[PDB]
Each structure stands twice: as structure tokens, then as C-alpha cells.
Amino acid sequence: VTQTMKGLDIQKVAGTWYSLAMAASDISLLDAQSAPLRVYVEELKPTPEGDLEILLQKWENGECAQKKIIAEKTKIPAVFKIDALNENKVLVLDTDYKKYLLLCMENSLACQCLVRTPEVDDEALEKFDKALKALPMHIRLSFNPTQLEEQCHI
Amino acid sequence: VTQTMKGLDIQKVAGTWYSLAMAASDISLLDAQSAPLRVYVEELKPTPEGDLEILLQKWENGECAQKKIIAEKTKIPAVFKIDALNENKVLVLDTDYKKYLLLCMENSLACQCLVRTPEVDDEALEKFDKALKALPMHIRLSFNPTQLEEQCHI
Ligand SMILES: CCCCCCCCCCCCCC(=O)O
Ligand SMILES: CCCCCCCCCCCCCC(=O)O
């Protein structure tokens, strides 16, 4: 991934988001309901000191569960690191703050097109697919407005 | 689907094919290993009287199984009908016979990009994605050359 948002103002991504589309390098990352990177973003919560808290839902043990994970800031504004067994980065590729936000996670690679409202934003999906053609994705999903209004996009 | 191959010569699609990419209208059609339209084409076998026999593999009961299904000809050369509880059509969208073949099945809709050899044919995938932008797909998968040489693309 060699797309990052120049001049990102992280405080301005705060609030409500919808995981409109997802893609990943390996089918197994997204294939099933309980696949490891089948995560549905609810809210982005920047800290005053510039970390990025992410509220999301994930299907685990036959149930739609709440998760809260902290992605810690780095020297680069558009790059955050999640504390785990593995060093994994969260990258903000692009955003206009008010409509769409493109982000990826890598260790191999998964990405999402986030939007502010439960609508199919063709313009944001164009920007997502453009970003992705530089990346070796083998699975891509997208949700309809009804699914976007349901826990775990059921 | 309002893309069919003009002047199709069905006898010339005979032989070996690889399911390089798949897409479908509903995630559930392709999501898991045993999803209903997760089928891997092995061979196309036109009959002398112009029907299209399809040899494929499908994951069923925790196993990669052989299937043979007959798609019967219609008045339209690029449209075939599979005998089931439901009337389902197989449509040949496009082919150059020697490299790629795009086909869909509808009742809602799933499509594949077939290629003759276990290679990622970027040119055929461009033609596949072009065909698909006219269609309401919500899941898309693609296979690497290693997976293409394995039973059920394992
Ligand atoms: C996949 C790109 C969008 C990034 C979404 C936020 C990153 C968090 C996903 C990592 C897995 C979270 C599940 C957990 O381990 O509790
Ligand atoms: C999905 C577009 C490619 C068409 C592949 C050939 C169509 C056959 C799939 C229908 C399901 C076959 C499994 C079975 O019912 O035995």
C-alpha cells in the first residue's frame, strides 16, 4: 500500500461510519461470516493525543459482538499501529471527511470503503476500486442500504 | 444481463477451462467454500445437437465433488436452460474461444471469467469487470495460478 492521505486531520474523521465495501488479499480473510477481517466499523474515535479508537462489530461464536480496538499513532499522520503478536498497520488512504474514508490494514492486506450514511456512494466506490487496482485483492464484498442498517450487515 | 455473444459457435467452446474469477448478486451465493454457486468449471462439452454439458467441481459435505450438469439449447445460440425446480438460464456473454469465456447464470445472478490456462489474464479480467458494471454484484472472487491447479481451488 503506497497510498496515504496527505495532510490528514485525524480529529475530523471522528464519528459515525458504515463499511460499504471490503476487499482483501486472501479470500479466507473475508469469505465467511466469521472470517478474521469481516469487521463492520461503527465509529471512529480519535483521542486528543492523536490515537484512533475504532468501535466495530464482528461475528464470533455464532453472535454479532461489539469490539473496541486502539490503533496507536505513529510519526506519520495517516499510519496507526495496533498492539498484537504481530505488528499490523492501519493506513488512511483517502477521505473527504464528510462523505467517504478509505482505509486498509496490513501485517496480508484488507481494505474498506467507509461512508457516513447508509447509501451506495458510487463515487466513493470508484475511488475505492482505483485504490485497489494497485493492490493484490482476491475478494471484494459490498453491502446494500438495508444490510448497512443491520448488526453485522445481516 | 443484456450482454450476449453475437455469432456464438458453441462447438468451439469445447474443452478445458479454469474459473479464474467469479461474481454474484448476493454474498451468500459465493461466500463460503460450500456456497451454492461456488462451482469450479473443469470442461465444457457441447453436444452434436447443440446442448452444453458442463463438468465442474463443487465443495459438498466437507468434500470436493465432481458434477456434470446439462444446459439445454434454446432458440437463442448464447442462451441455455438447466432443468430444475426453477427455470435458470446460462448465458454466454463473450468469448474469443482460444483464451477467455464470460458466462453468467440467472434465475439471482452469478457470473464467471473462464480462461484456457492457469494464468491471471488481466485482459480477460478487464472484459469481465466491464461486463459486471452493468450488473448488481455484491461479491467477487479471483484465484491465483496455484489455486487454479487444485481441486476446488484449495
Ligand atoms: C480492514 C480495514 C479496516 C480496518 C478496520 C479496523 C481494524 C481492526 C481489525 C482487526 C481485527 C479486529 C478484531 C479483534 O481482533 O478484536
Ligand atoms: C455461475 C456462472 C457459471 C456457470 C457454471 C455452470 C452452471 C452450473 C451451476 C449450477 C449449480 C450446479 C450444482 C448442482 O446443482 O449440481
Side-chain angles (χ1 to χ4, degrees), chain A residues 1-74 76-125 127-129 131-154, chain B residues 1-74 76-125 127-129 131-154:
Chain A
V1 174
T2 64
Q3 176 169 352
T4 50
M5 173 71 188
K6 305 189 83 181
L8 178 60
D9 178 350
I10 197 67
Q11 300 295 339
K12 296 210 308 208
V13 308
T16 300
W17 295 96
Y18 289 84
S19 292
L20 169 63
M22 318 172 171
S25 56
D26 303 277
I27 288 162
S28 58
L29 291 172
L30 286 183
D31 63 6
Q33 213 179 4
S34 59
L37 262 296
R38 195 96 151 233
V39 299
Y40 309 95
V41 170
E42 157 175 345
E43 175 175 11
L44 292 190
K45 293 176 64 158
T47 69
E49 62 276 30
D51 293 326
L52 186 67
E53 293 196 4
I54 310 170
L55 304 212
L56 53 90
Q57 331 160 316
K58 202 196 179 316
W59 197 270
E60 278 177 358
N61 297 286
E63 189 138 299
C64 187
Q66 309 312 311
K67 297 225 175 295
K68 179 178 190 179
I69 69 106
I70 320 290
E72 305 200 325
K73 77 169 179 172
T74 71
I76 306 162
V79 182
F80 300 82
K81 199 268 178 203
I82 302 160
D83 190 34
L85 176 62
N86 311 96
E87 300 181 313
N88 297 319
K89 304 182 172 179
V90 170
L91 300 100
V92 180
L93 303 211
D94 194 23
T95 188
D96 76 2
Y97 303 113
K98 71 192 192 300
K99 272 141 74 163
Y100 79 93
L101 160 58
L102 310 183
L103 89 178
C104 303
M105 181 171 176
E106 73 192 13
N107 57 8
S108 205
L109 166 71
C111 306
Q112 302 201 345
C113 174
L114 305 181
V115 293
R116 288 292 202 175
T117 61
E119 296 172 294
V120 173
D121 182 352
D122 279 347
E123 160 71 319
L125 293 173
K127 287 178 166 170
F128 184 54
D129 292 330
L132 292 187
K133 44 170 156 62
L135 314 177
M137 302 313 210
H138 293 93
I139 180 153
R140 183 196 185 273
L141 315 174
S142 67
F143 301 91
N144 71 41
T146 300
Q147 294 173 322
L148 288 180
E149 275 293 280
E150 302 284 349
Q151 300 289 100
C152 287
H153 290 193
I154 226 72
Chain B
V1 174
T2 64
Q3 176 169 352
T4 50
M5 173 71 188
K6 305 189 83 181
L8 178 60
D9 178 350
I10 197 67
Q11 300 295 339
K12 296 210 308 208
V13 308
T16 300
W17 295 96
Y18 289 84
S19 292
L20 169 63
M22 318 172 171
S25 56
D26 303 277
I27 288 162
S28 58
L29 291 172
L30 286 183
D31 63 6
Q33 213 179 4
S34 59
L37 262 296
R38 195 96 151 233
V39 299
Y40 309 95
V41 170
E42 157 175 345
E43 175 175 11
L44 292 190
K45 293 176 64 158
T47 69
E49 62 276 30
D51 293 326
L52 186 67
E53 293 196 4
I54 310 170
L55 304 212
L56 53 90
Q57 331 160 316
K58 202 196 179 316
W59 197 270
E60 278 177 358
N61 297 286
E63 189 138 299
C64 187
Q66 309 312 311
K67 297 225 175 295
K68 179 178 190 179
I69 69 106
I70 320 290
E72 305 200 325
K73 77 169 179 172
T74 71
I76 306 162
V79 182
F80 300 82
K81 199 268 178 203
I82 302 160
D83 190 34
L85 176 62
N86 311 96
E87 300 181 313
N88 297 319
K89 304 182 172 179
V90 170
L91 300 100
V92 180
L93 303 211
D94 194 23
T95 188
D96 76 2
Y97 303 113
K98 71 192 192 300
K99 272 141 74 163
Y100 79 93
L101 160 58
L102 310 183
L103 89 178
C104 303
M105 181 171 176
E106 73 192 13
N107 57 8
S108 205
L109 166 71
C111 306
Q112 302 201 345
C113 174
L114 305 181
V115 293
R116 288 292 202 175
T117 61
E119 296 172 294
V120 173
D121 182 352
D122 279 347
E123 160 71 319
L125 293 173
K127 287 178 166 170
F128 184 54
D129 292 330
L132 292 187
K133 44 170 156 62
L135 314 177
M137 302 313 210
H138 293 93
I139 180 153
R140 183 196 185 273
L141 315 174
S142 67
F143 301 91
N144 71 41
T146 300
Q147 294 173 322
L148 288 180
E149 275 293 280
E150 302 284 349
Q151 300 289 100
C152 287
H153 290 193
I154 226 72

